[PDB]
């Protein structure tokens, strides 16, 4: 797996295929992509972009840490899961975030992926909530100080 920078526009296809296939493509054009300091990483395997992850600065009112980043659009293509593609993106992002002085990385995780974030050392906070039309989510975070 090779981790490389990618542009926001490079994430839309996999966001649409994996996360939001039953909505128009504009639903994958996350407004947070246009927030200050946003960046995106791709995981490449055998000539193909097969994993994506997007990050931007956002402080959650219920999490503690002066500088925080949110993860959006975490996805790995079927066929290429279980190869540490996603973990590789998160670890590479943690380097970038640590270098920027970020204290914490958080995600409104799909509950179906909660065990993935747990393996990466994230904790859950609060309760499960629903996010139309993409189902149950739970706040998860990782302190990176």
Ligand X SMILES: CC(C)(COP(=O)(O)OP(=O)(O)OC[C@H]1O[C@@H](n2cnc3c(N)ncnc32)[C@H](O)[C@@H]1OP(=O)(O)O)[C@@H](O)C(=O)NCCC(=O)NCCSO
Interface positions with ligand X (CB under 6 A): 18-19, 51, 74-76, 81-87, 107, 109-110, 112-113, 115-116, 119
Closer Cβ to ligand X, 102 or 109, answer by number? 109
- Report, in Å, the least distance between residue 137 CB and ligand X: 7
- Report, in Å, the least distance between residue 79 CB and ligand X: 10
- Report, in Å, the least distance between residue 66 CB and ligand X: 24
- The answer to whether 59 touches 68, Cβ cutoff 8 Å, is yes
Closer Cβ to ligand X, 6 or 85, answer by number? 85
What residues contact 29, with CB distance under 8 A and at least 6 apart?
Answer: 12
DSSP 8-state secondary structure symbol assigned to residue 120:
T
Helix (H, G, I), strand (E, B) or coil at 133: coil
Output phi, psi for 63, to 5 deg. -120, 150
Output phi, psi for 144, to 5 deg. -120, 15
Closer Cβ to ligand X, 14 or 102, answer by number? 14
């Amino acid at each position: 797996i090779e981790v490389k920078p990618i542009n926001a526009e490079d994430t839309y296809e996999l966001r649409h295929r994996i996360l939001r296939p039953n909505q128009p493509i504009e639903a994958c054009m996350f407004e947070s992509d246009l927030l200050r300091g946003a960046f995106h990483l791709g995981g490449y395997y055998g000539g193909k972009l097969i994993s994506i992850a997007s990050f931007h600065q956002a402080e959650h009112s219920e999490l503690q840490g002066q500088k925080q980043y949110q993860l959006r659009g975490m996805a790995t293509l079927e066929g290429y899961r279980e190869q540490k593609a996603g973990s590789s993106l998160i670890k590479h992002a943690e380097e970038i975030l640590r270098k920027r002085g970020a204290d914490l990385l958080w995600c409104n995780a799909r509950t179906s992926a909660s065990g993935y974030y747990k393996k990466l050392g994230f904790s859950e906070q609060g309760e499960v909530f629903d996010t139309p039309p993409v189902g149950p989510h739970i706040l998860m975070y990782k302190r990176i100080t």
